[model samples]
Target: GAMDPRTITMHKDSTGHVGFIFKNGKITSIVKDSSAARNGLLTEHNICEINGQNVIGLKDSQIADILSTSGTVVTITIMPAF
Candidate 1:
C-alpha cells in the first residue's frame, strides 16, 4: 500500500546523511544541497523500503541499520506524497 509509481531511489555514504528527516515514518524534511535534495527527495516522502525489503513496521534502528552499514553505500527507496 505504500509503494508508488512516484518512487525514487537515493544514494548515500552509508555513514552519511542523505538529508532525510522523518516523523511518523514519513520524511518531514530534507537538507538543502544534500545528496537527497540534489537527487529529488522531498518533504513528506515516506520510506517504504530499503535494499528492496519492505520496512512498513520496522523500528528506526532497523532502518538505521539498513541505511548505515559498517562500510558501504546505502540505497533508499522512497514514495512521494501526493
Candidate 2:
C-alpha cells in the first residue's frame, strides 16, 4: 500500500549535518534537537525526491552525493516505508 507523500525542509545544523540517517532510500533515524526532527521528519520514510529532483531507485551513495552537494537547505519528498 502507498502512503501519502510528505515534503519536508531541513537545513544543515551547526555541524553541517542534515540531522538524519538514511540508507537504501529509506530514512532510518532522525536526530533529536535538529532541523530534521524539528521539521517533522521520521524514521521509515522512503526518499522520493531531493530538492525537486526525482531520486527514486537511486543508490544510497548517489543520494548521499546529492545531499552533500545540495548546499545548506534541502527539500525532500518522502513516502512511508510501510
**Top-scoring candidate (lDDT):** 2
**Reference-based lDDT, residue 62, model 1:** 77
C-alpha TM-scores of all predictions: 0.70, 0.91
lDDT of each: 0.67, 0.89
Q: Evaluate model 2: give its TM-score.
A: 0.91
Q: Please provide the root mean square deviation of candidate 2 (C-alpha atoms, Å).
A: 2.0
Report the lDDT tens digits of candidate 1 across residue range 1-82. 4446344556664456666778666878888877777777756777887667788778777777766662333456667666
Over 4 Å off, model 1: 1-3, 13-15, 70-72, 80-82
**11, model 2: CA deviation in Å?**
1.0
> Which candidate ranks first by TM-score, i.e. highest?
2
Clashing pairs in 1: none
